[PDB]
Design a protein around this ligand. Structure first.
Ligand SMILES: *Cc1c(COP(=O)(O)O)cnc(C)c1O
Ligand SMILES: *Cc1c(COP(=O)(O)O)cnc(C)c1O
Lengths: 449, 446
């Protein structure tokens, strides 16, 4: 396979042995990438593309950042990968770095994935508090309890209440049964909500002595160089992973000492948590992001792309809302088909836009890469308007309140209406928690008797 | 410069879980390894028999693995917008050719996620609720509770504790509710035929047989327990697969692996390419003629030498299992740990759980260094701790062997009244349960 490969040839070859049809092919754009460098990808046939996917967000610096590659390589080649001691010098150095960098970080422990990191957060909160329930919203991974918690309501078998980014719901739940709540675990969403919304949520949780835990597996290095926490939101636990080691598998659970101290009795482990090279890569990432001007230039490139996309859509008369942080901004359109069609078509013009509508520049981006992506977006939007007028309204105006409320529920389970059904759902859920048969409960470690 | 106790104190304030990170690791903090040897931060050298909890199969800093991972990282990249990659395709092809059970293979980062994928796939593919389990499968709630005999209705998992009789009665009473059997092979107390019989029993109930070989996959043999002639519908491997780099693989029958999409499994690091390159180098080394056989000879050299030392000092003992994962069972649970701890003073890291793990980099000198330290440590513990070091010879009692199986892996091997009552009690609780109470199932089972 050293030359003369084709996208279609290897896709077919992958279908025979490993490809999940929808997850691996139908959803991915159907070229197969052979290398990356900075802001650009190269497929096995030599086609080049500007990358706005960041590999689903795990990359923050760009592909093959040399500081990260050197630090990973030195560890692997000159020292080793995994030792009989779970402690290592790079693990200690990184934990010290993280504790100095974050006011919420008094102690830090590590794992391989965001799904395991947020599971660790719930396990630690339960073991530390001796309480049963987790109140959750936002995506936390692919385990059942995480997936089910994105929907508002109560899953008694997992001990998770979903509260749908609804401030009122959370306050009423804490008032009604907060003494049973081991923690709140929320993935910050920054298109619909401001920093103050999360500051008030921390304050609410602290008034009930409930740990406030932010899942910033996604936002950790894209809401700002220190995540949402670094914008002034206090936290008892923060989980990070995407960007942490620039695409290499590493997650960090950082938090206040009495919660992290519950590790031993929580039963958390994992034979790869000790893996050393990724921790050297993470310290290289932190050195790059803390270099003066780097993060500022990246945000300028994200603003350049977002503003250009807004102009292209507004100039064509397509109703649109472009918002959010510069390094993780969303584009909302009147319907869900229009964006996907544009993003797909733009692949023909040499750019990998992220299908879901959140674009993710990296620090390696320069203006030529942004402007190549705008050229492709401009051409793709014009073609979709021409070919698919049934989904491409061009008569101006703003998104309706209906669409914005519906999209929040659809996209992230945010229940943002103050109508009777939402308030009825709030009261039903609280009733189901309060009047429950308490003999039916998830497995708790340690047991809560 | 840097000291063990200096770094440990630093570690305590910022990251160290006292028991898991310190209390259970023999004092020194490792700085490097090479082949069979470790070097701590003060320069002390040690023969390594832990294999870093089994993740290492070739030894530290094997050159072919390092070359493969470095080329990928430096010349191509780490993770791409396509979840498919050329090394993923090649590794899946290679694994499918290598294993009879492997019609398709998907990947993840850890054994715990690998075995979770096995259960999610079995449920999604069969549309059934229950997983019957025994043996360690990871640190998630349902995995840990599953090691204990009994039914956990909120996870949909029944532990059957390596009890053949229990399993057969369970499948007769409620096998049409069983999405899969998930077992971690134990090869000290059981032979290959035991797992062959288990495969056949699940088969005639149309129940997928899934082997968690996260541990055994390259240490029961170069192709795991499955390679010794045990058929399986799913096999999970991980430890050894990329020689310490984080990769797991879930291999199995098309109709079960094809349920990936509807199962809701994902993970943004499952596409990570460098560990797949490392795995192909590992399979290259393992399949070089002479390499695996030589490693087993070294394991037998170590095990035989340990048996000779204990028997010659009068310590009742049982040394058994495969050469690359053999166990040393002693009359009580304190003696082993005291010997292994003391042996660290003589330049060797024994695995203090009692299962020693040579790697393919071992030579006779490395084995004999471990044996020299083991002799000195055993004799010191005998002189210093006669309260836990009986020297009157003989064999382990049947009571001790039976109790150990229960303590170490939840094996209920007794044919007594209290075991049979547990079997009947568990079946009754499954059959007569409130079937409105059920775990989260993806897709929903209606
Ligand atoms: C990606 C993500 C996760 C899951 O992390 P994985 O490594 O893919 O398991 C959890 N929470 C958030 C907010 C994420 O973006
Ligand atoms: C180690 C182990 C696991 C868990 O794997 P991790 O990578 O540590 O999560 C699961 N099953 C068996 C048999 C194991 O030995």
């Amino acid at each position: 396979d050293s030359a003369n490969l084709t996208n279609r040839g290897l896709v077919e070859r992958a279908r025979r042995v490993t490809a999940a049809e929808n997850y691996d092919i139908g959803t991915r754009f159907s070229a197969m990438i052979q290398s990356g460098e900075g802001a650009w990808l190269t497929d096995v046939e030599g086609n080049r593309y500007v990358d706005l996917t960041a590999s689903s967000g795990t990359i923050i610096l760009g592909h093959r950042n040399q500081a990260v590659t050197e630090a990973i390589t030195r560890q692997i080649r000159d020292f080793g990968t995994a030792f009989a001691s779970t402690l290592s010098v790079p693990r200690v150095e990184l934990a010290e770095r993280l504790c100095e960098r974050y006011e919420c970080a008094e102690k830090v422990v590590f794992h391989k994935t965001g799904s395991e990191g947020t599971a660790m957060a719930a396990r630690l909160a339960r073991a530390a508090t001796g309480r049963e329930l987790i109140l959750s919203c936002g995506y936390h991974g692919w385990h059942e309890w995480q997936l089910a918690g994105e929907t508002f309501g109560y899953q008694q078998t997992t001990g998770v209440v979903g509260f749908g980014y609804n401030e009122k719901a959370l306050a009423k739940m804490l008032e009604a049964f907060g003494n049973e709540v081991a923690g709140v675990l929320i993935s910050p969403e920054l298109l619909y909500f401001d920093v103050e919304f999360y500051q008030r949520m921390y304050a609410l949780c602290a008034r009930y002595d409930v740990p406030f835990m932010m899942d910033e597996v996604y936002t950790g290095f894209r809401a700002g160089p220190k995540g949402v926490h670094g914008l002034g939101v206090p936290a008892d636990v923060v989980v990070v992973s995407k960007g942490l080691a620039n695409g290499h598998s590493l997650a960090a659970v950082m938090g206040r000492r009495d919660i992290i101290d519950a590790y031993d009795v929580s039963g958390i482990q994992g034979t790869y948590t000790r893996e050393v090279p990724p921790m050297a890569a993470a310290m290289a990432v932190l050195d790059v992001l803390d270099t003066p001007g780097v993060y500022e230039h990246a945000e300028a490139m994200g603003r350049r792309l977002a503003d250009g996309m807004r102009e292209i859509l507004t100039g064509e008369g397509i109703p649109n809302w472009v918002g959010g942080p510069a390094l993780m901004f969303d584009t909302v359109l009147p319907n869900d088909d229009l964006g996907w069609e544009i993003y797909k078509t733009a692949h023909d013009f040499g750019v990998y836009f992220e299908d879901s509508g959140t674009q993710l520049v990296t620090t390696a981006f320069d203006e030529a890469a942004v402007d190549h992506a705008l050229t492709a977006f401009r051409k793709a939007t014009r073609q979709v308007i021409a070919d698919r007028p049934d989904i491409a309204p061009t008569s101006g105006g703003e998104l309706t309140e209906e669409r914005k409320l519906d999209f929040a529920e659809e996209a992230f389970g945010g229940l943002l209406r103050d109508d009777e059904r939402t308030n009825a759902l709030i009261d039903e859920t609280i009733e189901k928690v309060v009047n429950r048969d308490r003999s039916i409960k998830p497995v708790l470690i340690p047991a809560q008797n």
